[PDB]
């Protein structure tokens, strides 16, 4: 039974590609989550503009990690202070540190939360 | 071979005649150097040469060597058939030097 070629091209046949089944794991111990909430949130900001945002905009201002994004900041704030943010804005300061504006919901009082943190 | 060695080892452990419990092996001879030496020693009775030894110099002299030494020789099809006789993938040449009386 001679196989009929209808393409005038020979294209490399598909062969089984086994998945990796190592005899040993290259790393003995998996690293811990390198960016957890205690590393994500560095410090709050208590400058006069930071206070103004707290007392009017219902917004908390934090010094945060460079590798922290908006999603991780929201999860860190939710897990560290039990208040869910409605909005997060971030900027890299001219000194190289990241600063996050965290707008809380109407359900939460930014003044109260600042008081529990202790920097107010 | 392992079974025979185990059986004869038990025979030695039981202290019987290990040298006479076994019989002379009757089998085809293989291996290029071994077969060539047998042909030169006139011990080979029949020689079978693979038709497609990829480096042809390995067997190209064998028909002339067998003709000079008066050894009957044949070029048989394919290296693998000679291999499967000797339980290998390949055999360049096979040699028959001794057989049994019924196969004479």
């Amino acid at each position: 039974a001679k196989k009929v070629r209808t393409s005038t091209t020979f294209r490399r046949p598909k062969t089984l590609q086994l998945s990796r089944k190592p005899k040993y794991a290259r790393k003995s111990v998996a690293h811990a989550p390198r960016l957890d909430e205690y590393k994500i949130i560095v410090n709050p900001i208590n400058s006069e503009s930071a206070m103004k945002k707290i007392e009017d905009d219902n917004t908390l201002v934090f010094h945060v990690h460079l590798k922290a994004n908006k999603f991780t900041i929201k999860e860190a704030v939710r897990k560290l202070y039990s208040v869910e943010p409605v909005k997060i804005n971030t900027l890299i300061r001219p000194n190289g540190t990241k600063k996050a504006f965290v707008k809380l919901s109407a359900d939460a009082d930014a003044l109260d939360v600042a008081n529990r943190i202790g920097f107010l | 071979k392992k079974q025979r060695l185990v059986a004869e080892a038990e025979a030695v452990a039981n202290g019987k005649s290990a040298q006479d419990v076994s019989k002379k092996p009757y089998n085809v001879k293989y291996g290029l150097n071994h077969v060539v030496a047998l042909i030169e020693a006139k011990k080979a009775k029949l020689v079978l040469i693979a038709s497609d030894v990829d480096p042809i110099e390995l067997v190209v002299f064998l028909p002339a060597l067998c003709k000079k030494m008066g050894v009957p020789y044949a070029i048989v099809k394919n290296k693998a058939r000679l291999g499967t006789v000797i339980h290998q993938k390949t055999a360049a040449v096979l040699a028959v030097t001794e057989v049994r009386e019924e196969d004479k």
């Binding site: 040993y24 003995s28 111990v29 205690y38 949130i41 560095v42 202790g118 107010l120 | -």
Partner: protein, 121 residues
Amino acid sequence: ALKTFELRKQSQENLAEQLQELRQELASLRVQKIAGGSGSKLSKIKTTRKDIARILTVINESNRLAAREAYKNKKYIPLDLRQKKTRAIRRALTPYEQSRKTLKQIKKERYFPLRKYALKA
């Protein structure tokens, strides 16, 4: 101060709560430092930092020893658990296979070794 020996004789989960409590304490201390704190608080910052380091050391050593126990008497083990002397040392011939010899040399050394001799005056 947290001392490593009673840190070592506890469980991994218990040390997990201690580590998380210490991290929260460090966060509170840093908030105190930026809101105005005394030298006592600022000294506790370094003490808490070292206690966190000691705990993390204990977790890692417990994890590594557990990996060593699991991979004990295994032909292939993780690279970080293997030896690390130098790259060349790992690539050199082992003393077993440096000392391998042919039967020709074994016979020569067996029958004609270097003899202990001496000369009279």
